[PDB]
Amino acid sequence: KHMVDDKIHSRARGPIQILNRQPMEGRSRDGGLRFGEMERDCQIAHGAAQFLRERLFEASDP
DNA sequence: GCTCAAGCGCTCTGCTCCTTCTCCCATCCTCTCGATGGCTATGAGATCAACTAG
Numbered sequence: 001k002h003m004v005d006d007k008i009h010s011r012a013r014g015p016i017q018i019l020n021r022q023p024m025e026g027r028s029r030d031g032g033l034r035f036g037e038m039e040r041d042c043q044i045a046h047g048a049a050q051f052l053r054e055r056l057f058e059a060s061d062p
Numbered sequence: 063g064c065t066c067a068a069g070c071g072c073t074c075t076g077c078t079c080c081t082t083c084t085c086c087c088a089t090c091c092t093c094t095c096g097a098t099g100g101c102t103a104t105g106a107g108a109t110c111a112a113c114t115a116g
Contacts, residue, residue: 007092026092038089 021061035060 011025016023024031035055043052 009091028093034090036089 016061023060 010025010029011030011032014024014030015020040052040056043055
């Protein structure tokens with residue numbers, strides 16, 4: 001039952017939550033992906049400070 | 063009978079045991095199922111601050 005047509009999802013400035021102005025959840029609600037603690041961890045190891053700021057502040061909830 | 067002792071109870075850690083208390087338990091993603099959610103009136107008095115004239 002795993003048809004790719006039900007797994008593809010992309011987000012570009014869609015709806016945001018009400019408690020926090022962060023992107024919604026679930027492709028059904030046009031929500032973005034979660035840049036979690038391990039992702040920030042790997043970006044820290046990279047040293048991409050500007051990319052980390054863009055992901056966690058600029059592209060999430062300015 | 064005149065000074066070193068022997069004890070002595072009281073206090074100060076302290077040492078270990080037992081008990082109690084707070085936190086903690088990978089990431090991301092999809093879907094459905096259920097629960098939830100509140101909606102007295104109508105009138106009476108009385109004050110007050112802003113228009114509308116004087």
